[PDB]
Each structure stands twice: as C-alpha cells, then as structure tokens.
Design a binder for these strands. Sequence first.
DNA 1: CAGTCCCTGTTCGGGCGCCG
DNA 2: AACGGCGCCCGAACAGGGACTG
Lengths: 555, 412
Amino acid sequence: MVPISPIETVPVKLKPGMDGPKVKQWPLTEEKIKALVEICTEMEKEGKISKIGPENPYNTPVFACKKKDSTKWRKLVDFRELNKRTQDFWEVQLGIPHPAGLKKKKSVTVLDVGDAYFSVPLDEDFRKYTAFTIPSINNETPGIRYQYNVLPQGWKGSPAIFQSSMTKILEPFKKQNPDIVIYQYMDDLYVGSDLEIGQHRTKIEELRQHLLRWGLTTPDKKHQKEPPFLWMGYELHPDKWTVQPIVLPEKDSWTVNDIQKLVGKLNWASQIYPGIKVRQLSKLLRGTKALTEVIPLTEEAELELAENREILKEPVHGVYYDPSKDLIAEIQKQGQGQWTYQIYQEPFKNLKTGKYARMRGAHTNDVKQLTEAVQKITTESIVIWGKTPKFKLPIQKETWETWWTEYWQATWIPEWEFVNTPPLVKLWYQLEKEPIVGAETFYVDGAANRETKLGKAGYVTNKGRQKVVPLTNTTNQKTELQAIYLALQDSGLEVNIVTDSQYALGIIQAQPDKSESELVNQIIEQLIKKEKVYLAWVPAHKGIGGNEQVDKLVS
Amino acid sequence: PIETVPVKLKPGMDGPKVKQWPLTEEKIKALVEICTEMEKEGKISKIGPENPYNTPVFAIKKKDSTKWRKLVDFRELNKRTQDFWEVQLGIPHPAGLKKKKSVTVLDVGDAYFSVPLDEDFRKYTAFTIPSINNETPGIRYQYNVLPQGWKGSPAIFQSSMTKILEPFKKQNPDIVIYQYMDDLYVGSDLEIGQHRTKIEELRQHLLRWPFLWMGYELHPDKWTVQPIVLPEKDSWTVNDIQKLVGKLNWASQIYPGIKVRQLSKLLRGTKALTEVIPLTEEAELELAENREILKEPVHGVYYDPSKDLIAEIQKQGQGQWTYQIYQEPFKNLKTGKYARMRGAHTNDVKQLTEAVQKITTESIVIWGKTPKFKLPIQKETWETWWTEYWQATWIPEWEFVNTPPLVKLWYQ
DNA sequence: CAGTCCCTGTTCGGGCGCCG
DNA sequence: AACGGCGCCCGAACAGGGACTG
Ligand SMILES: Cc1cn([C@H]2C=C[C@@H](COP(=O)(O)OP(=O)(O)OP(=O)(O)O)O2)c(=O)[nH]c1=O
Ligand SMILES: [Mg+2]
Ligand SMILES: [Mg+2]
C-alpha cells in the first residue's frame, strides 16, 4: 500500500512478443555495497521503492558513480536489456539552450530540483518489470529484492517522462505569471524577471511552493541567488556571460585519445573564442585506429595548437540578446577551407562566435564554402534567436552576382553586405561563353585499359600541333583530365579546348579552386595563368571534328 | 454522432517518426496561437512522450494573404496510408478539368475538422511545436478530427462532400468540380464575370453547412508547352555545328528519326572553332527534316495511372526555368518553361519554390497526381529556405540532383 | 543488353566536447 | 560498467550514373 503521487503517470508498454529483463547481477566492490543499502532503505520508507518477493521472475544489475562535486552517490540501473524490449519514446528535448539567446533580466534565479527522477512516478502496470536485488554482504546474505515506483536512472524512458511531467506542472504557474521567463532544461530551472529583487524572491517562493504540491523539492543547497550564476556550463553575469574555465591538457607525448579530448574542448571553446582552428589537429586522427597509440605533433599541428592556447589566454565574454537591435553575422576566411564568424548586435560586443571548416566534395571553391557557412550560421541563428542575421561577407557584390547567375544549380544568400577585410573571396578564373577568335583549338582525348591500367592522353590542333603521352596505372577519367592538362600546358594565353569527357567538363565548369586530386589542382593552376579559356563538349564516337582524329591516337 | 472510419497503415510499415526542424519566431508564435484555439475547440489534444510518432509542422501564408496557416508535413504518413486514399476510398479524376477555360481553387480543409478521426489512428498524427533557444521542451499534440494535409481526410469526407455539392452540380451540370487534398478545383467555360459569380454561389452553399474567401484562379486552356527548337543562323561556325550535332544526338533518344550524317560531314578535319562553315545542299536538307520531326509528336507517349509522375527542372538563367514531366524516361507527358516569376534576378530559391508549386498545380489539374521532383539545388540550400517561400497547403516529394549543362537542350 | 569499373555522393555509428 | 539531448570530425558501408567490355 503505497500512496499515489500527485504527478500523473505515463502509460508505458513494452514491445509485443517480449518479456522483462532477466540479467544476473555484477560483482562490485564492498564500497558500493555500503552505499546502496542505505539508499534502498531510505527510498522504501519514502515510498519511492517497494519490496517484492518470488512472484517477480526478473532481475537487473545495478551500480553507482560519484555525484559531480559532491559526497553523495548516484544510483544507476543498467537497463540496457530493458531498453531493447521497452517501447520507443519520442524525445521532447529538441536542443540545448544557449546563453547568447537569453535576454536582459533585472532579477535571475537558478533552481535545481532535488531527486528529479525519484520524484516522478512510474506506470502502475510497468513497475513489475523493474526488478533488482541488493546483497547486504558480498557472499553471505542473499539480500531482499526491491522494485521501482518512480523513474529509475539508466532507463531510456526516464528523461522524456520527467521533461514532459515537469512541463505540465509548470504550465499552470506560467499562465499565472506571464512576464516571468522560465528556462526548463531537465531539472535545472532558470527563472528571470524584470521585477525588483524583493518582489522577485516572492514569486520564486510561490514557484517553490507550487512545485512542492507535486512533491518537487528545491533545496537551498543548489539555490543560486547572487551572480555569477552557473547555468548550463556558463557563468551568467548581469550584463555579460562567459564559458566556465576550459583547461587544455599539456602532455609531453600525445596519443590518439588525448587529441580527441583536445579537439573537443576547442570545439566547445570556439563558441565565444574567435579564431580557433582544429584542422591540423584533427588531421592526425586519420587512418590510425588505436586510441592508445602515440602520435607526434606535426609542425602545422604544433603552430595551430600554440595559436589556440594564446587565444584562450585573454579572457573573453559574450553579451545577451536585445530584440530591439538587429543580428549581424560577419565571416572571415581563415584559409585552407577554414572559416570563422562572429554574431553580434553592437560592434565588438559578440553574442557568440564559431567556425565552419567542413570539406564536402572532392572539388569545390571558396564561394561554395562561404555559401555553406552562411547556411550553417542561418540555421544556428534560427535555433537561438528565431531569425536570420544580416550578413557581412568578404566577397564583392559583383563576384557573388557573377557566380550565382551563371551557376547551373539554384543558390542564394540572404540579405548581406560587402565588408572589405582581406583575404577576399573571389573566382580565380572564368570560362568563356563563346569560342575565342584567333586562339588555337585543341581537340583532346584520353583512353585507358581496364585490365593493364595503361593509357594514353594527347591532343591535335588546327595548326597541326600534336602530342600523345603514354600513361601507366591510370583510368579513363584520369586520362581525360590529363589530356586537358596537356592542352593547357602547351597552349598560349588564349585557347579553345574540345573534349568528349562529361566527367572532366563537369569538374572544370564549376570553377573549383581546390581539389583532393593533385591533377585537378595542376589544371586549376594552368587555368589561372590563362587569359581566355573556352571549353566545348562533343559526343564521343561520332566522327565530329578533330575529336575523331585524336580518338585514333589515344586508342 | 458520426462513426469513425477505421484507418490502418499499410501492412509492414510503422508510423512516421520525423524530427521537427527549427522554426522562426513568427512561425512559432503563429502555431502557438493556432494550436491553442484548436485545443480549446477539441480539434487537437496534448500528448506525452509515450507516443513514438511525430510529423513536422510549420506555418505558411498563401498568395496575397496576411493570415498564418498551419501546415503539417504529412508526406511520410501519406505514403504509409497509400492503400486507403487510392484503393479503398479513391476520388476519380475528371479529364475535362484541364479543358475548362477557368478553374478556381478553394480551400475547404476547414470542413475536415467537423469529422472525428479513428481513435486507433490519432497517434500517427502527432506533431511537436518547438521553442526558441529551447527554453521549454517540445509541446506535443495529436489530432482528434480529420487533419488538414493528410490524404485520408478528403477520402473520408468524400461521402460528406458529395451530399453538400449535390444540389450545386444539379443546378450547373456543365461545371467540373475536383477535390484534391484541402483544395477544391472548380472549372467552367463561363465568362470571367459569370464564372466568379458561380464561384460565390458555391461559397454560400458551403457556408450553409477561414480561407474560404480566397479564390486562386487558373486558366488551363492558356497553358503552353516548350518544344525542342533548333537555332536559325545566317552563318554557321564549327562550334555552332558541334553544338547542333550534340543537341541533335541527345534528342535522338526522344525522336529516333533524327539524323546527323550530313551535318557531321561539315566537320571533317581538325578545324578552328570560329571558322565559318557554309551549309551544303544535303546539310540544309537534313536540318530541315530534323526541324519537322521536332514538330511531330513522340510515338507511344500516354499517361499510365499506375505509375508515378516525375518532374525535372533546369535553371536556364535570367529568370528562365524549364521543366519536363514524365513517367518513363524520354517519354515526356508535358514540357514547359517559366519566366519572370517572383524573385527573378535576385533569388533562385524563391523562383525554384514558385516553379515547383506551379508544376504541382498543373499535375493536379491534368492527372490528379503530384510529381516527385528532381531539384537542381544542394540539399542543405533547399532545406534552409524553401519553407520561407512556400504558399501551398500540400507538399510534393523531391530529390536533389547536380547535372552540369553539357548542352542546352530545352532552351537554346 | 548485363556486369563491371571509376568516381562521387549521402547515411550512420562512434570518437570527443558539453548539458542534465 | 547506465540514459537522453546537441555539436564537431572521423571512416565504413551503401547508392547511383557514365563508360567500357563480354
Ligand atoms: C548528471 C545525470 C543526471 N541524470 C538525470 C537524473 C536526474 C536529472 C538531474 O540530475 P541531478 O540534478 O544532477 O541530480 P538530482 O537527481 O536532481 O539530485 P540533486 O543533486 O539535484 O538533489 O538528470 C542522469 O540520469 N544521469 C546523469 O548522469
Ligand atoms: Mg537536481
Ligand atoms: Mg574521350
């Protein structure tokens, strides 16, 4: 006979055709034994845990880990087998709140619900599926087995149920206090208002007594009344916010697992520290698949690491969001496909920073990667502020106009303005739209053997110029690119090039300035040196122009 | 007082589990106000996390309208109930709708809220309203009545719709009325004044039983096609003929009678691209014959009602967009071109969005289906902006392609 | 015409950071 | 040694289209 809590239960079922968990316990140290017997006894008197008998043919191993920055212990239940047989839940946590999205509030209070999961009841018909034994002695007393009447920690349905239950309890209080902002993330509550300090504490106590009606306690242990407030891993001040101090490890010998933690902290730090790069550091995590393997730092990864530690020396901070002012996002090119940005409303008062260094595609250019960065910043801004910032981009209006009007795919950038901060983004060469009068016409082609991997590449011209180059360990695609490279090498500043390769033409027409292919990069270098290049395509094996003549030479 | 029509998913398929995407501030505020009124009226109810299903939701404004409309992306749920709104309770498509002089589209989705939904099926209509900066967890609802945007809503309401439209069709036997999704397509051969007058009579027929005041007008008789055309020059260069032979060779996949023998003979040798080549007597003969074949229709091209429609769009530049609708490759049921749409010369995504909506509307009128689109755009670019410019209550299927223009096929 | 190859694309799961 | 959320950078597995060969 246990009292039913005021919180409405969530009807939880299991996947049909499956039973409950039947897993043997795990032998643990005697320190863990003396830390769990005192918990199950306290939860039994408080009604949070009921005792069962032989009528429950289920079992699940448990353990514990130390609470962060405390002497208390966190009781965990390894429900990994129960989660496989429990129904799926739809998660209601859609993201992480960011301090740059918080508005200015005169009074701020950060609460913390004590025993979050242990205060929300479990489904009545589901409590029988949560069985676990607690041995008093490691090899003497069999230990009476208990069950769960609340939400166990370790179950895949506990977070979704608590977050949904906490919302229904706060809904009546928010309806009675509309001007009060309550950021509800798990059990931690951020309460802000423009009321005076005295009147603010009054509504805080009203909220504490409101939650107490459903058995939710807000102890004065983790009750924050004075700034700076520690919320979501940040330091919240009345007029600014900053990330809690980030400590980077400084080992003499670097392994693989150490760099993974290093890049992760720099990714977390780049949200407010401008100019953080992790290209050369993450480049070391390629190929090697041994976490306990020492990796020597390259000269590029060492200079990148030294520049990141210097940025973290001077303290930085972000500001809060003012809806009366516009959102500005300015991007800088860091080179080698690296982009950094800052989002602000007043000059040099950054709300947050960030970086975009993703390399998608074997061939691309700065204009494509800038477009991708704009899209990343836009979606990120809609999550945090619900609107798109005005962009300040290091690309000329004429440059962008030339790119998007001529590209074959739909592409667009929202309202933006040019900012003259080198290095500027530009197109490094422009293919002509009509053939060039007086320029030599090169008919290029390339063939390769599928078996021997041998091939040829060459050209013929209208002036009688001709070349055929034998190639070893190649493909048909590589010989077509090689044929174009030969034409660019052996031609003047202005040249017309005719090819039948849809593969090669598609790469070059997209005006790439960088490539994972060394051959394409050499082709790009030649295209930049030229003054006029006209690429033309013809269907192969049709007796068209000199394409039939060069086809005989290479095949 | 109405028995709920039993609805079941297609055997072997679970409900939709699609994540909600981020919404702008004005869209979230619009949905919070709309869903509050719907919950007060019992149309929707709040649910918990024990419902594992979810469908995205956002808001739109129709053309020349300042009112927010709630739009649920039921595309996943619709193809998981395909044997319901196509096999069991299907709506026949009138072939005469496309022949009418004027067709008006009326939003009648509000009438679906008067019919309850099957209790065993309501769990599949779940959606989640997000919050700015994740201040609060997602607010989940589910529909208690027939939801707008679900293809099962007009199928269940079809029996109710027939009795309401029964007197009006008797009064005007020449008017064709087609129902697709939340819309009602009304076509007639009356004059503009007579047509709009008869449209208002139909509105009053529905009133005696919030977007009914709007009327998007169409003119399918004014719809044109964009055939494959060849250039006509006074002088021809080597490059001009190489482009012509390349275009005619690709067109041979559609018209098997096209020949390039006499035209390829003009390119004998290794000539400069800009060198002028006079057309021989046989070359003029072959080029004149190919121009007539492009006017002749394609053999064995007809609509199969059991096959899906496919739409390809090409960005031609300067506000020009070409498109082809087909079921089998090189068997185009319709080709066309759009020019000077909204966003021309400034926004590709708005134009592409406008083009998709136009093509889908044409497909609903002509065949009663929406095509699956092959969009010439990167996925991340489209998924970032398309909801900002969407003005329709339905959403077609689409995929993303990247085909560089090796030869201008549909627009020289 | 099938069956491959070459090349490029997306998807997904895990590594790490971070929150509770 | 547990669960859920979001982000990044990584590699393996898979998909799809042009082109060559039997
Ligand atoms: C940190 C953490 C948390 N949780 C769940 C449980 C309760 C909520 C909040 O956890 P908590 O605030 O740190 O502990 P809590 O149970 O609230 O007890 P208090 O310290 O607040 O009194 O999230 C979890 O399941 N695993 C974890 O590692
Ligand atoms: Mg707590
Ligand atoms: Mg070739």
